[PDB]
Nucleic acid binder design. Structure first.
Lengths: 94, 136, 79, 116, 178
RNA sequence: UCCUCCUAAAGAGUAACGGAGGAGCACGAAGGUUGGCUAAUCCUGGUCGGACAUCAGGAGGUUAGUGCAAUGGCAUAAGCC
RNA sequence: CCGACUUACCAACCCGAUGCAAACUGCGAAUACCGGAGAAUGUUAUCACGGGAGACACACGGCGGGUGCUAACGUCCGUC
RNA sequence: GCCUGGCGGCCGUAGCGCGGUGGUCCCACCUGACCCCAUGCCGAACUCAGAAGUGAAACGCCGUAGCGCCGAUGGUAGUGUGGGGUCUCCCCAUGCGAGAGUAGGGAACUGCCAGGC
């Protein structure tokens, strides 16, 4: 199923993004081309564990944010250069 | 050896190493030397590490060399004063930022890839990382 | 061989000030080395010789981009 | 082609006349008809026009697009400008060579009292 | 008169029968014919101008056009270019009468159609062949020039139809009589 | 001594026995105006014009040209007649 | 061979992916800089003229660099 | 109101290409030219007189997004000002925030005058 839990982002910006990454999170965004983009934060290590299975980019997954569920597809992954961690991911609504 | 055959000018300024790496993902093969930390890779060490990799894989598989030494760095010789022109070029260097994939391999399994990569990282002055799984 | 030679150049950049006190003509863009990507359109016929853009009448300097090739245009219009 | 070359030949006089900010007298010539227009210096707004496609000049001449037809067109536009009160218009060649119909047009505008 | 008389015969039958054409002038009309000579690096000869007068002004009193090498690229000794390329284009109905005298020296006599000169078939719009022979000499002496006169003649029309390839001249250049 | 680029930090300016090049002229047209034209390269048909000498069409926008170095400019081409 | 050629290399070129440039730019910041309007603060600090000098041998540290080996309490610049 | 011509504004969301459409309304091909002018030859080019014929080329309009072109929010790089760790580099507070890509947009809009309905 590869469901993810996410929370809506409290603050936007460079310092907020680095603070989320220092607190074991990472920013991401939900966009679909028909409705307004919604910016989420996620627990980094669960997305690591379900990304190591290569089925992240094949099938449509679910995000449990704020009590509502969006069925999306992984667009692109922004990773750290020299670390197995990542910094950002993008989602297309499908 | 591993230098440009023609260059627009015979010397260029030293400069500073930039912030981050560019082209960090595996692209051609399945495994690569993802660099950590700044430095200078010269032509002889990349030739030595490629020779070690080719020796370890025994002419099996394909090896792509991602970096190229396109920066000419000049050494003033021994017992010569300071000034009176820039020195002549002695060796050719490739500037490395953290995350830049240096080497590539495909067609060998994980064991022989990591073995040749161990020998190459032993030859090089720059560390490597470890993400090793199959490519999609 | 010995490559220690250089030529002195003095000012190759704009000083269009648009409110300071100068009657009519001022070297709005002097030693700009070019006539095409900075033309004169507003206050009559600039770009005489060495392509120095100079005004015609009193006023403020207007920088705009127009034309099919998106070149820049220096215009002077009165208050 | 021919129309593109004509526009490229016109561009000197067009941007020169628009850059001195002068009222222009623009010609357009076809093998079947001859046109004329006088244009305010902003260029988007024209004052009067005269052509052989209108019947008021077209009934007089048995062929639209002649030497004397262009003379009649020139006296038409010049009297329209004179009754409108404008004067000292500038001839806009607009890429046709100064010969033939436009020469008749120009000396018709000259002899009809429209100064250049 | 020659243009209208050629418009009567063997042209309007090409509009409906083989390839149907919507308009009258959709058929490729015979545009301007041009001829180009191949005089080389020899400027010291003077035969080129009066040879051009012989091939151009057999009836009229026309003059050729000569110009230098303005593209001016060569592996040879000359860079800026002497007058080498002399361009000749015919005037008015002399293009048609040049075509008419070419085909009346070509069809009844097998001298001008000596071999398989028309082997190349083109549908691009350009068809060229070096004739290497005379058509009409203005003087009584038909051969006073020592050269074989390897000039190039390029018929500038779209030869999509094969009527020009079989009726007027053929590929094997064999005239046929019944 | 004088030009052009870079170092020069997106106003000017800014050093070094720093890194690359040019000038000590030329033109009575290669100045002015009027009128006109658009390039380098690829291809098929064509003369012992062979890959390029002159053709004739498409592609191809200046990738050529600027009397001479480099930079900035050009279709109003300041290029060419 | 105007047909067995046209491969186990460049298919000159061109297409896709990946890089690299002080003397590359189809992009492009922060800052600085120039010019306007507004308040508040500042012993009018700003500008001109006139009387009187000194100085024109600088050093380190941070930032941007040339050179050097990204050596030097090295040297030469910009700014504090 | 519809369809064209001229001059403009904004300069590719305004361009190239594919398929269709309009004909003395208009526009463009077209006949002839040692009448005026012209070809470094050529009435292809430029002019003059015009009558036949044509929408073929070309022009204009409408579908086609196959490429050009535009392109956000985010994130990233960078950086002004304070502070901190240092092999040449970076981090933290704060302000400003790219470029390339992505979602997508997109096969124009509008002004004056003249002509045919």
């Amino acid at each position: 199923m590869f469901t993810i839990n996410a929370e809506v982002r409290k603050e936007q910006g460079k310092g907020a993004s680095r603070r989320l990454r220092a607190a074991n999170k990472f920013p991401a965004i939900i966009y679909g081309g028909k409705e307004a983009p919604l910016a989420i934060e996620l627990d980094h290590d669960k997305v690591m564990n379900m990304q190591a299975k290569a089925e992240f980019y094949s099938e449509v997954l679910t995000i449990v944010v704020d009590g509502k569920e969006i069925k999306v597809k992984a667009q692109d992954v922004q990773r750290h250069p020299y670390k197995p961690k990542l910094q950002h991911i993008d989602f297309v609504r499908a | 050896m591993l230098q440009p055959k023609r260059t627009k000018f015979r010397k260029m300024h030293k400069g500073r190493n930039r912030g981050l790496a560019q082209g960090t993902d595996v692209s051609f093969g399945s495994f690569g030397l993802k660099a950590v930390g700044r430095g200078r890779l010269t032509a002889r060490q990349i030739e030595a590490a490629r020779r070690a990799m080719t020796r370890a894989v025994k002419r099996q598989g394909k090896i792509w060399i991602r970096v190229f030494p396109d920066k000419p760095i000049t050494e003033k010789p021994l017992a010569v004063r300071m000034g009176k022109g820039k020195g002549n070029v002695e060796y050719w260097v490739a500037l490395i930022q953290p995350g830049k994939v240096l080497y590539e391999m495909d067609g060998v399994p994980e064991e022989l890839a990591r073995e040749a990569f161990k020998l190459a990282a032993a030859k090089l002055p720059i560390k490597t990382t470890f993400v090793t799984k199959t490519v999609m | 061989g010995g490559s220690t030679r250089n030529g002195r150049d003095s000012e190759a950049k704009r000083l269009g000030v648009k409110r300071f006190g100068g009657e009519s003509v001022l070297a709005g863009s002097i030693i700009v080395r070019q006539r095409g990507t900075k033309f004169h359109a507003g206050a009559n016929v600039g770009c005489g010789r060495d392509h120095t853009l100079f005004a015609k009448a009193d006023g403020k300097v207007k920088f705009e981009v127009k034309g099919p090739k998106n070149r820049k245009f220096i215009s002077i219009e009165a208050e | 082609d021919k129309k593109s070359a004509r526009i490229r030949r016109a561009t000197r006089a067009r941007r020169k006349l628009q850059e001195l900010g002068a009222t222009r007298l623009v010609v357009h010539r076809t093998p079947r008809h001859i046109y004329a227009q006088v244009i305010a210096p902003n260029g988007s707004e024209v004052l009067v026009a005269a052509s052989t496609v209108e019947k008021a000049i077209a009934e007089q001449l048995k062929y639209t697009g002649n030497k004397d037809a262009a003379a009649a067109v020139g006296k038409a536009v010049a009297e329209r400008a004179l009754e409108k009160g404008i004067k000292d218009v500038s001839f806009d060649r607009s890429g046709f060579q100064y010969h033939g119909r436009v020469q008749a047009l120009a000396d018709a505008a000259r002899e009809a009292g429209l100064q250049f | 008169a020659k243009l209208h008389d050629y418009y009567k015969d063997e042209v309007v039958k090409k509009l409906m029968t083989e390839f149907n054409y919507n308009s009258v002038m959709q058929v490729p009309r015979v545009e301007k014919i041009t001829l180009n000579m191949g005089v080389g690096e020899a400027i010291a000869d003077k035969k080129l101008l009066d040879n051009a007068a012989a091939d151009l002004a057999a009836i009229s009193g026309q003059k050729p056009l000569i110009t230098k090498a303005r593209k001016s690229v060569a592996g040879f000794k000359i860079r800026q270019g002497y007058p080498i390329g002399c361009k000749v284009t015919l005037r008015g109905e002399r293009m048609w009468e040049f075509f008419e005298r070419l085909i009346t020296i070509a069809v009844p006599r097998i001298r001008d159609f000596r071999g398989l000169s028309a082997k190349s078939f083109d549908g691009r719009g350009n068809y060229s062949m070096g004739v290497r022979e005379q058509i009409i000499f203005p003087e009584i002496d038909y051969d006073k020039v020592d050269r074989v006169r390897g000039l190039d003649i390029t018929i500038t029309t779209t030869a999509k139809s094969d009527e020009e390839g079989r009726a007027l001249l053929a590929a094997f250049d064999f005239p046929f009589r019944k």
